[PDB]
Amino acid sequence: AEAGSRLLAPLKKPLIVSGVLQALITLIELAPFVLLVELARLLLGGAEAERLWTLGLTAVSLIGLGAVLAAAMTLWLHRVDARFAHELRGRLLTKLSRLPLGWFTRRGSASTKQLVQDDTLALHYLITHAIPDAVAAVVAPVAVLVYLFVADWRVALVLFIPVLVYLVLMSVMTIQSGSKIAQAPRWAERMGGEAGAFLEGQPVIRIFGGAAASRFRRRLDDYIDFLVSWQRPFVGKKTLMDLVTRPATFLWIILVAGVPLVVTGRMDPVNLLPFLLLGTTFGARLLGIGYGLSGIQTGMLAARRIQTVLDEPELVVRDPGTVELDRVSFEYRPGVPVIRDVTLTLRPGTVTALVGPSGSGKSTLAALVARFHDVTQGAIRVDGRDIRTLTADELYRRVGFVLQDAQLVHGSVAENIALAEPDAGLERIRTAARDAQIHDRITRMPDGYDSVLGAGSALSGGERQRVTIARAILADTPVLVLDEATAFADPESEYLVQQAINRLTRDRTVLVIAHRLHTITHADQIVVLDDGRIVEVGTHDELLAAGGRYRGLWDSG
Amino acid sequence: IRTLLRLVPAEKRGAVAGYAVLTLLSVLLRAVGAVLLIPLLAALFSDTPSDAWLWLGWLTAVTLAGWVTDTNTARLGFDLGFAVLSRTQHDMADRLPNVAMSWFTPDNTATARQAIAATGPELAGLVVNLLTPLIGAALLPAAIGVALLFVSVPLGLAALAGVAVLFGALALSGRLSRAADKVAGETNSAFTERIIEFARTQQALRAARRVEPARSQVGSALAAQHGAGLRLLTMQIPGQVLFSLAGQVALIGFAGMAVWLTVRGQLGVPEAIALIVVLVRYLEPFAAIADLAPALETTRATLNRIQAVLDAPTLPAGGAAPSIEFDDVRFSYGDEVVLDGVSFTLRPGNTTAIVGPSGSGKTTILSLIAGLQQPASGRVLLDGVDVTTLDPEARRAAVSVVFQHPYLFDGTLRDNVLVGDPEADPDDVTAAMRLARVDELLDRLPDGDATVVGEGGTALSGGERQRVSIARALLKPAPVLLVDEATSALDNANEAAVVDALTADPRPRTRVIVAHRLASIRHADRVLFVEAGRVVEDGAIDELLAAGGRFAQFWAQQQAASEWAIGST
Ligand SMILES: Nc1ncnc2c1ncn2[C@@H]1O[C@H](COP(=O)(O)OP(=O)(O)OP(O)(O)=S)[C@@H](O)[C@H]1O
Ligand SMILES: Nc1ncnc2c1ncn2[C@@H]1O[C@H](COP(=O)(O)OP(=O)(O)OP(O)(O)=S)[C@@H](O)[C@H]1O
Secondary structure: OOOHHHHOOOHHHHHHHHHHHHHHHHHHHHHHHHHHHHHHHHHHHHOOOOOHHHHHHHHHHHHHHHHHHHHHHHHHHHHHHHHHHHHHHHHHHHOOOOHHHHHOOEEEEEEHHHHHHHHHHHHHHHHHHHHHHHHHHHHOOOHHHHHHHHHHHHHHHHHHHHHHHHHHHHHHHHHHHHHHHHHHHHHHHHHHHHHHHHOHHHHHHOOOOOHHHHHHHHHHHHHHHHHHHHHOOOOOHHHHHHHOHHHHHHHHHHHHHHHOOOOOOOOHHHHHHHHHHOOHHHHHHHHHHHHHHHHHHHHHHHHHHHHHHHHOOOOOOOOOOOOOEEEEEEOOOOOOOEEEEEEEEOOOOOEEEEOOOOOHHHHHHHHOOOOOOOOOOOEEEEEOEEEEHHHHHHHOEEEEEEOOOOOOOOOHHHOOOOOOOOOOOOHHHHHHHHHHHOOHHHHOOOHHHEEOOOOOOOOHHHHHHHHHHHHHHHHHOOOEEEEEEHHHHOOOHHHHHHHHHHOOOOOOEEEEEEEEEHHHOOOOOOEEEEOOEEEEOOHHHHHHHHHHHHHHHHHHH | OOHHHHOOOOHHHHHHHHHHHHHHHHHHHHHHHOHHHHHHHHHHHHHHHHHHHHHHHHHHHHHHHHHHHHHHHHHHHHHHHHHHHHHHHHHHHHHHHHHHHHHHHHHHHHHHHHHHHOOHHHHHHHHHHHHHHHHHHHHHHHHHHHHHHHHHHHHHHHHHHHHHHHHHHHHHHHHHHHHHHHHHHHHHHHHHHHHHHHOHHHHHHOOOHHHHHHHHHHHHHHOOOOOOOOHHOOOOOOOOHHHHHHHHHHHHHHHHHHHHHHHHOOOOHHHHHHHHHHHHHHHHHHHHHHHHHHHHHHHHHHHHHHHHHHOOEOOOOOOOOOOEEEEEEEEEEEEEEEEEEEEEEEOOOOOEEEEEOOOOOOOHHHHHHHHOOOOEEEEEOOOEEOOOOOOOOHHHHEEEEEEEOOOOOOHHHHHHOOOOEEEEEHHHHHHHHHHHHHHHHHHHHOOHHHOOOOOOOOOOOOOHHHHHHHHHHHHHHOOOEEEEEOOOOOOOHHHHHHHHHOOOOOOOOOEEEEEOOOOOOOOOOOEEEEEEEEEEEEEOOOHHHHHHOHHHHHHHHHHHHHHOOHHHH
16 A cells, blocks of 8 residues: 555655645635625625626636636646656666566566556556546535535535435445445456457357357356346435435425525525525535546556556676576465476586476576576576676676577667677678578568568568577577477478577587477486476486386377 | 447337436426526515415425436336347347458457457446436536526527537537547657567567666667657646636626626516526536546447447358369458469368468468358359358358367366267267377376366366367368368377378368478378468479479478487587
8 A cells, every 4th residue: 555655755745736726726616606696795785886897807817817727737737747757767667677587477467568658647647637636526525515504504404414315325235235346346357258268269159159159148148137136126226316416406405495594584595595506516526526536546556556566676686608506496476386496507518408297397497597587595506606696797698598489679680680799790690690590581681681670570480580599699608598499489490490599509508498308319418397396317318218207208209 | 329229129119218208308397497496586585585485386396206207217227228238238249150250350359358348337327327417417508598588588598509609618628638638648658669669678688788778778768758748738738627617707607697687677686696596507517518528438439349349241141072172262361462363172082281381371271261251352162162152051061170279168178079069979979089089188187078178177288279179170070171280299199189180080071281290291182382372382292292392392391300309410
């Protein structure tokens, strides 16, 4: 709860000043409804035309001042909002450059798009619209109530009859429907998921048909019946509550409570005019507070998300390519081990393959080797130096990586290939591309090597993967984490990517994340992982002769 | 919005007529309740307030009538809202299976998902939360203005003109508000679009050791754009201020006109005060419309989505191995062309094996053969009969397909298998599970063939999902069996199952396989090498191998690739 407020801490005083100005603007907005009561006081006195011209001047001045104050306040608030939002984007930029690389491979949480684009816009709306609108929606009914009570308390009290009846019926409906309203969002997300599944499985319905449509139709009918059974018994309460707060009912109550007082002489007939002017619409004004509070809540949720981002755990810097894993243990979630006391020594020049069943956690160990995360226990040493004491450049000029879902940077193809070493000449880029088996395709492109890449381009997956492999070749990293799934990412161009990987694995201490067993039989070392722990270590022949888990995996293959 | 007239079911049309006439009655009763304040407050402010009792009696009688009509309209509103929700949802659910597959673009898929998912509570209470208050607030100022003609012709005429002026102000305020919101979203997206690129390429920038120059560049760009970004949103200021200022200026105008008529002697002071109060009743509805405007915008968006889904195109209507034949077929995903004068013929029973590069229209050709899509030009024949003219039942019964994705649903593995032919006997089901090598998976599963295969039930890997998909395809008695391969090298049993499906299946049906590896197309009687949407080589396996063409190069590449191993050459 405090996280949401902590983000908006520097905007304390500007928000308070904006709230004060909005209270002033709302009180000025209701000024003509008091000048009209004064006009009624004046006409019945039959005074001169000057005493009405001055009142007209006052009303014109007050509406003009209200408009000018609203314009000035919204200008200043937009300026402060832009000033704060630029600072927030600047602070999020640095955080994205210090969060661990594994943070960007998250799941079960909002993507960066919703997290920086939509949430910052939500904060903008919170600062500029939701807070001033809510302050207005709170100041208006309070000021109206105070003015009505000042006018005549006897007729001000009868306005609590419909308001209290509205509150009573609302409370009865809410308590009577606590279980259903608690259960409603679960039904909503369930129906959303079912609709997505029904739309995804359209071709099966198209050809096979069957009960695929009826399965979704039953869910839809259940949802409709749930809504009907939820809202049908509350028809009477809802409609009576709606009737009570209508302006016409307020007017009738006002007149029935005022005419007896006015006729008997206990009340000045002019004092009833405030109630007829402002008090009759009091129900709609009290109903509007919830909308402003909902707006504030919606903004503060986005504030919560952004602050939860800004306090993530960013990578701490403590203090011939051999890699030593020393009692490494890792937990993505606390209390849920994924790696448990694994020890290894990737000797120099040895292709230490990594193999295990799906969900065994073999990719995780390579991720820790590249320092996508920090090992919770033990330590990972590269060249005898713990990775935790190596700054980012020093680490990543020692431990490169070629993992799945290769990313391209906005720029020329001669920039993507030369990202590690931009000073490399064009001939070095060309021979690196030849080594990656991509020089054939790049020359086929119209602009050649200067073609702009980015979010989308003419190259398919099996070609941008080879461009990234060319970049990894040119970076010249002694250690090299490798994801073997890149070999068959595009099965059409499997052979070219295999040639590129064979050239990339020339003289590097490689840690292959093996999915296919038959591409490992020449590996200088193989590690069998299951349940996040090493079981059997040795070459292909030794592991098969041992008659262990590796023999079972090989036979299953 | 006129779409609601189509959305409401035909059996509730009488309810619509009753709702309309009772809403008009309610607005008339509220107008009489407001206009009755003229004589009532004329008597109250006079020297004999006792004359106000009669008008108070009439006003409270009108209020009772208004309460009765309002509760009737509310009951009808709840009934009609639930009815139209049910009708719209059922029509949308029934329409979609008949919608042509060309319509299912990802934006259209998103709109349909939103229409099915988030439209429950909104359409449930649409007509009570939005239509009744909106119509009441829209018609009541007109009703009071018209009813004030008799009290005073100039005052009533001025009020009636003010109705149009204030509705114009409301429309202008809505235009400026939504345009300003659009501009705000645009500038925020423009500012943050570089942070998205910084986050997406974070691995590449970090690994290449360019994170510091890249971050400095992004920050400098943000600062430079923010320096010039202080000139934005000059039209947001009259967003809501314009409407409120217009309303208050109208209030001052009406009050001043009442004062002027009092000075001119056409109205008494008590009736002048009463007219001020009544013309404050007149402006009160316009606030309600402004409050309801965002909800109206959301409802308009939802109804636009429902209209888009309900107006989607529909496919026109119309056991030996068929001969699949193409006659200059052309197809395009909008503007991009996927086929260009492709023509070929598949012999009945001969296991054709399409191969070629990616994005070359292989899966597209299989889809056109299966009738999921239609050919934009030319004909797709099954034994000389155009696919478009096939009956829907014959359309389903003709072709069986193994899709690239498995397309499984939550439920028992058995029930997933039976959807190929739910009337199939246990013998055929056992044969299909054996030919698909699903019986091996049954040993893995705890409960056997009845095991739930949903994500919450059992998390199957790719090989098992593809094997049950092959079982689905084999079970159905379709004379055509397309196999769009997505076989994974992590499961050799999947390849064995595909080979069994193309070989061990006893039903004499033509088969078309879009293959990546050489495990399956070894048993291919003919091959169609499809490159860039045009068949470049056609013939037998050995013929193409001897010719030394493109297919020979593909065979050499795939055969060499299978013998790949790291750390040796
Ligand atoms: N961020 C995370 N949050 C929760 N669980 C995680 C996370 N990352 C990994 N896991 C768990 O780690 C196990 C899988 O480890 P991974 O290395 O990520 O995948 P994997 O074992 O390599 O799968 P394959 O098919 O072998 S690549 C599963 O039990 C996951 O639930
Ligand atoms: N739903 C879609 N929306 C837009 N373009 C599409 C869609 N489906 C396919 N395409 C494109 O249409 C062209 C032909 O693709 P396909 O019909 O899948 O042929 P393909 O070679 O079998 O594709 P793959 O990669 O092998 S599965 C390619 O350029 C695809 O990117």
